[PDB]
Write a protein that binds this DNA or RNA. Sequence first.
DNA 1: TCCCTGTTTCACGTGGAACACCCT
DNA 2: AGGGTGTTCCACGTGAAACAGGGA
Lengths: 264, 264, 264, 264
Amino acid sequence: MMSEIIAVANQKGGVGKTTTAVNLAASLAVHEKKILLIDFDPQANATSSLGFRRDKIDYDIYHVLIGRKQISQVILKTQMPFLDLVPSNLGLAGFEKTFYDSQDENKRGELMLKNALESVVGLYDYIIIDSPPALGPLTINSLSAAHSVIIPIQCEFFALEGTKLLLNTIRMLQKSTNPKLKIRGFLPTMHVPQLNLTKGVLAELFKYFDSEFFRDSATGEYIMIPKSVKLAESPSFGKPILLYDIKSNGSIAYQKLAQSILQG
Amino acid sequence: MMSEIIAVANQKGGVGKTTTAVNLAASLAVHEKKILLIDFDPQANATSSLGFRRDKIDYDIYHVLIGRKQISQVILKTQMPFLDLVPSNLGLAGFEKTFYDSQDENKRGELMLKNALESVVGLYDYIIIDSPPALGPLTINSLSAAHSVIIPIQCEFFALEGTKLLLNTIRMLQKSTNPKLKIRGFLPTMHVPQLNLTKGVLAELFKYFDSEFFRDSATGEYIMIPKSVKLAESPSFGKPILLYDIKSNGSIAYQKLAQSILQG
Amino acid sequence: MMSEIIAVANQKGGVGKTTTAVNLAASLAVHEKKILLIDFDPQANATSSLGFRRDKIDYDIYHVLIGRKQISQVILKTQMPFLDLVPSNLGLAGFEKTFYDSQDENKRGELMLKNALESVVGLYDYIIIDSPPALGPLTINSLSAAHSVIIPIQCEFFALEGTKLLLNTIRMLQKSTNPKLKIRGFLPTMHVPQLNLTKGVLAELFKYFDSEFFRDSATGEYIMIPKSVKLAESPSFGKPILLYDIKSNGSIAYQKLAQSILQG
Amino acid sequence: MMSEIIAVANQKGGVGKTTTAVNLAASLAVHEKKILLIDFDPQANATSSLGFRRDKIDYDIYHVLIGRKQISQVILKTQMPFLDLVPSNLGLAGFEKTFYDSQDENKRGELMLKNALESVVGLYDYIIIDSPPALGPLTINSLSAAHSVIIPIQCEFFALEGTKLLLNTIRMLQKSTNPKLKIRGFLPTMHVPQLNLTKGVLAELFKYFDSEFFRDSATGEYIMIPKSVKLAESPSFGKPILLYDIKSNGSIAYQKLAQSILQG
DNA sequence: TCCCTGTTTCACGTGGAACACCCT
DNA sequence: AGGGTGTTCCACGTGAAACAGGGA
Ligand SMILES: Nc1ncnc2c1ncn2[C@@H]1O[C@H](COP(=O)(O)OP(=O)(O)O)[C@@H](O)[C@H]1O
Ligand SMILES: Nc1ncnc2c1ncn2[C@@H]1O[C@H](COP(=O)(O)OP(=O)(O)O)[C@@H](O)[C@H]1O
Ligand SMILES: Nc1ncnc2c1ncn2[C@@H]1O[C@H](COP(=O)(O)OP(=O)(O)O)[C@@H](O)[C@H]1O
Ligand SMILES: Nc1ncnc2c1ncn2[C@@H]1O[C@H](COP(=O)(O)OP(=O)(O)O)[C@@H](O)[C@H]1O
Ligand SMILES: [Mg+2]
Ligand SMILES: [Mg+2]
Ligand SMILES: [Mg+2]
Ligand SMILES: [Mg+2]
């Protein structure tokens, strides 16, 4: 039993991290794999998108990072039996201060998530972490605990530099804390293929990263999440799109992403 | 005179903060008012949108907040003679550590931007600050230095929640540090009027906030930024839309926002 | 009393003449007024629509107009007690030859329906005549026997012309044979309001004829027959829509037409 | 050089005869065959559908049937070089009277169109005649002039009866005037395949006529003209949909009909 | 070089209709 | 059988964007 830990990360906000994390988790569960999703963002969209309103949540991931609880007590089960969730809440916005308090004394604070996870890394196939928007303490925790990193990219101008900064952050940690950190793939999100800016931004990214881009093993096609109002309406129903609408282009793209992850 | 300081702020990223700040700054410069735009985001998309490479940038606003420099030495003149810029760079990601130490030291980190701002408030008509996506120390400094706040809102499922969060921080600061802090307007961005999700999100926001939504004085119409790829392409040219294409509906909408701000 | 005689007439076929004639007859019969529907079409769709098999057809209207019989021996009772029928037959196609023999002679042939009708005009409240698709001798007899005229209109490219053609005939007969003949209304059929061609034809008709269009007295709304597959399947059951499905939109529209006529 | 004469005929109005005659003519001309289309309806919708309004026409088919002129002087050229038209006008409504005068004397009146046509039967590949709505003298001349007959069928209840009647008219003329008359095919028009009324009427027709229904040369699939608002807008442009939009489903169906006619 | 036009393609909202469950 | 639902499926209208060319 070993779980692969995959962080979905991008300092930039609004690029599809939470949409990807939730729907990739559900898409991997349908292939009868056991999935643990970790909302690592204080606003807690992944939690809300699975129907847990964060008025209702009592104990957070934050409580676990404090040692105030063990991760086994915070886990919640979802409408899908093979998808459980460690929820979030705005209390985790305290973690930033704790991080620096850690830096004050201890050479410790980068691995508060890795240590919180050790309890369960052997009871799931995949642990998917939904990261917040920055290269701050929460995202560094996220990347320091992960085997693999999924980078969802919206194909507009700021994605260019945005990636650069992100990758340098990974490679410093590849020499730092987490030498095993791997990029599992780039994933274009909200993808509108006919727009000129999209064609140019993807061309410029391909020039350096074509190797990194997610592909369909059967056909070798790129896998990209189309822009689809169905995927934006999904959180309004507390469900991932494969329960909410299984043949939408958005849902099909996320299930192809699951299979490609499933090759290796 | 005395500058009015407007923060462009929102709990979420990717909702058009940087787009609104840049294009509002430029649209007020056309009516020949003198404007300073402050990139207050470590990713620094505002800087990048006005054509400044971030490597070419030497000493940033971070230095100014740290006292290594004073705000007058970092200002740069732009392709618009009536629009200057305080550039940013990821070095400003250091500020949050400073922030917590400052609050540890003497409850001091929330007005370090306001103090850095005293040097120049009487040399501009408008100072526009573009803040990062969270309610973190940088955004807190932005809202604590400002007289008024523009909230750009993308009309998707979490907009209600996110704004509630932002408004509850604004209300803590009006009772704390900046009591005259005012809401200058909500501004719907990337607005696609035909989508059901858009109409539903706008109906729910109107029920609580119609009063705050920017309106064109002439006709009483709402001001909404249309979805317009020209606006996403403009920063790859280092220009604001009125220089890249002044007849775009995105450019027309931002000139209507500029005029509405100028009426009072 | 005197029965009011309404011709359902229009230069072109397939615009709904038979459907409105039949269902208007039934919808007025529900208000317990006694009505005779006169199939004046050799194809005899009204006959078949009330369940009469044309094997059972033995003595037609054609027999009556030649004097072979009087209108009272051809009438038949229908499943509605307040609705009887003069059936038709392809034998009625013989009448046009008779017509020209007639006009060769004595200006005789335009009123042969009117004369065959006065044997019974004091035994019904309404006489509804279902005319054939042209401005030929049968339709000429129909419009020459009638007090009022219903014009069903399918809203496609040639409707304008058709009505103009029909109108010119009506109005030559108003100075010729039947001077009190009046237009009781235009009635849009098979109406699907979303089509651009529907909108364009209705605008073109409104500009010349708005006054003539049937209206619901209660609200002043136009009465238009919706396109409704139920109304096309009803005659396969030998029924009018009010017996085949009373809550269909077709039946509701025809009952509002009935009510509007009952007002005068 | 022998021209094949094809009548487009059906007693019922509004079933697509003129739409079929026009678009079949145009679809055959594009296959480099020379086509003469004959408007045999006094309302003259085929003529107007090719852009010649009926105010503008000088001498019509009627003048020719009376012998007042010869068919070569009434012909008109179309926007397509391989399709000419003998136009119509409401003067042809006089022909019914002419027919019966003929009947008094000579057993002739059934072939006055056949007589008018011999003058040109050797200068066209196909002569397509667009018939009026009844089994009156005009349709009789049409079927007595033809080698073959195309029967367009709208699949509603009245197509059952109507069909039987038309065939008897043909079988009687196959014993009367035109012994080589053949039906080249049934053609379902305005076809909406999912409607239950459609499935049932086609089933009842297939039971007697499956062999007669038009089929695709290549696959043996039925050829049916889909219900398409583009085909109803087509006369609004004075053009057949082959020029007005050659990729609409209506246009594709008619060009498949042309190819199938062209196999034999 | 600018900028006018028309045409094509695409996602989304809309509503009539067949249908598989539903109640009972 | 009767009287909901809600679900899928289709054609059509709409509006943003790309584009081809047309234009002195
Ligand atoms: N493929 C897509 N098409 C349309 N909208 C999307 C898509 N993916 C995400 N969204 C919407 O975009 C917004 C940002 O997505 P989210 O996953 O919350 O990004 P992040 O977690 O990176 O901040 C949300 O409104 C979300 O529902
Ligand atoms: N009205 C608009 N239409 C189309 N794209 C837009 C619009 N406004 C912003 N964008 C694009 O959306 C992306 C995210 O917006 P940005 O302004 O950087 O917001 P934030 O500062 O909140 O992350 C950028 O690629 C930007 O060019
Ligand atoms: N409102 C309607 N919706 C759907 N089908 C209709 C409607 N009105 C008529 N029909 C059908 O259209 C066909 C033509 O109508 P019909 O009443 O026979 O026309 P006409 O008598 O003018 O030739 C018939 O099959 C009829 O069932
Ligand atoms: N396949 C089709 N889809 C939609 N409308 C059609 C179609 N065929 C014909 N129409 C329209 O139906 C009406 C009747 O067609 P038409 O060819 O005039 O029949 P007819 O010649 O038998 O009287 C016209 O408005 C016509 O444009
Ligand atoms: Mg998120
Ligand atoms: Mg920004
Ligand atoms: Mg009829
Ligand atoms: Mg016709």
